[PDB]
């Protein structure tokens, strides 16, 4: 099969600035035909791919002239002038000249912001969840970018380094920042053998962490 | 307009099979190729296969020859997929989609909703549905914020919601994680401190699969 390599993975982009997408396939798609079929996707999250432009420059009905490509035999560039918050989600070529129709791998563009800090949140296993028998310590980092962070638990003042279940949400479309939650899942009788619960947050913002943290003999 | 429907979330077990539909409407379901396209959660896009519903001819990619088989119904304008001896490799949201870019006048490109599928052995499982209230003391910013944990339940998707949907802004719901083979979940939501708690903040928790639905109100303390 013919194989479609797309650059950069991810595409951090000011908000009316302008971004390039590269893809460069395994063999010229120039079809005998004389037609070169080589398309561009957009799937925004959730949501079914959606054709932004198809053999190589033309627009499909309902696209804006802001996005065009451009390419020939095995180079080709998706370029979108005046980038925003809309654009947000995952872009890929496609190649059909040839047979199966190929993918590539995709490119994620991220919307660029103003460096910011998460705000933290730590909450205790709840009565329901104890009377069960199990404890959950749930730690929100919210409204920060970039994406990147690094999350700490420590109990009695020891890092804990199993039973830590992350997620992350996806960038804000009207905020471009991210959020996540960290979940420290303990048994009942593990969770009441400690007192202090710590959740550390290590991000660019700054150099010292930001701490979170709740002692059991005191709530 | 061009629509392709296609049938909702199926769950499946090792080694079955299972079949899915998308219906066509706006266009000759007869005059284009239906495709077949596969999605892994993490991944790209892969084509297994197309059918020409006017004479019903298929086409597949060898690595799928054996695992689906395409099938379609002029008659109700329906096309069907049908996956056997499924595997963990199997789980993905599958699409079908309507391509053609050579007729002058109207380029043809529209894909389905897309339907997932899940092969598991997990039990159908209402989930746990656990408040979170802010830590004692936690009350001196501008904002507070509080949280909803779903643990233990099966197959997805689950349907939080705060205060029955008046409340949407200042939410995250993260995507659902495996723990054990039971997806647990968690959604925060922030507020004006002076709102809550005076003014209830509820948690609502719908679980089609198990035909559940609970409300938690997040108590203070």
């Known amino acids: 099969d013919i194989v479609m390599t797309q650059t950069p993975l991810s595409l951090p982009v000011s908000l009316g600035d302008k971004a390039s997408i590269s893809c460069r396939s395994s063999?010229?798609?120039?079809?005998?035909?004389?037609?070169?079929?080589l398309h561009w996707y957009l799937q925004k999250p959730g949501q079914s791919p959606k054709l932004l432009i198809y053999k190589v420059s033309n627009r499909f009905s309902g696209v804006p002239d802001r996005f065009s490509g451009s390419g020939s035999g095995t180079d080709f560039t998706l370029k979108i002038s005046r980038v925003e918050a809309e654009d947000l989600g995952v872009f890929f070529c496609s190649q059909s000249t040839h047979v199966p129709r190929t993918f590539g791998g995709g490119t994620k563009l991220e919307i660029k912001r103003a460096d910011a800090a998460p705000t933290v949140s730590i909450f205790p296993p709840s009565s329901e969840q104890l009377t069960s028998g199990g404890a959950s310590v749930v730690c929100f980092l919210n409204n920060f970018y970039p994406k990147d962070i690094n999350v700490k638990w420590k109990i009695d003042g020891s890092e804990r380094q199993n039973g830590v279940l992350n997620s992350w949400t996806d960038q804000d479309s009207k905020d471009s920042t991210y959020s996540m939650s960290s979940t420290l899942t303990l048994t009942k009788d593990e969770y009441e053998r400690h007192n202090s619960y710590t959740c550390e947050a290590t991000h660019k913002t700054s150099t010292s962490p930001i701490v979170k943290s709740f002692n059991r003999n005191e709530c | 307009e061009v629509n392709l429907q296609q049938s909702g979330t199926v769950l499946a077990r090792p080694g079955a099979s299972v079949r899915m539909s998308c219906k066509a409407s706006?266009?000759?379901?007869?005059?284009?190729?239906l495709h077949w396209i596969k999605q892994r959660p993490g991944q790209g896009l892969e084509w297994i296969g197309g059918i020409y519903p006017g004479n019903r001819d298929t086409r597949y990619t060898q690595r799928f020859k054996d695992k689906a088989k395409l099938t379609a119904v002029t008659s109700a304008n329906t096309a069907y997929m049908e996956l056997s001896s499924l595997t963990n490799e199997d789980s993905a949201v599958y699409y079908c989609?309507?391509?053609?870019?050579?007729?002058?006048?109207?380029?043809?490109?529209?894909w389905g909703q897309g339907t997932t599928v899940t092969v598991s052995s997990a039990k159908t499982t209402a989930p746990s549905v656990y408040p979170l209230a802010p830590v004692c003391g936690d009350t001196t910013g501008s904002s507070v914020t509080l949280g909803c944990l779903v643990k233990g339940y099966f197959p997805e998707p689950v349907t939080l919601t705060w205060n029955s949907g008046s409340l949407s802004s200042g939410v995250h719901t993260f995507p659902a994680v495996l723990q054990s083979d039971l997806y647990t979940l968690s959604s925060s939501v922030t507020v004006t401190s002076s709102t809550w708690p005076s003014q209830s903040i509820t948690c609502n928790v719908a679980h089609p699969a198990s035909s559940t639905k609970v409300d938690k109100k997040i108590e203070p303390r």
């Open positions: 063999q010229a798609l120039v079809h005998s035909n004389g037609n070169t079929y």
């Open positions: 706006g266009y000759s379901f007869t005059s284009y190729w």
């Open positions: 989609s309507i391509i053609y870019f050579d007729y002058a006048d109207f380029i043809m490109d529209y």
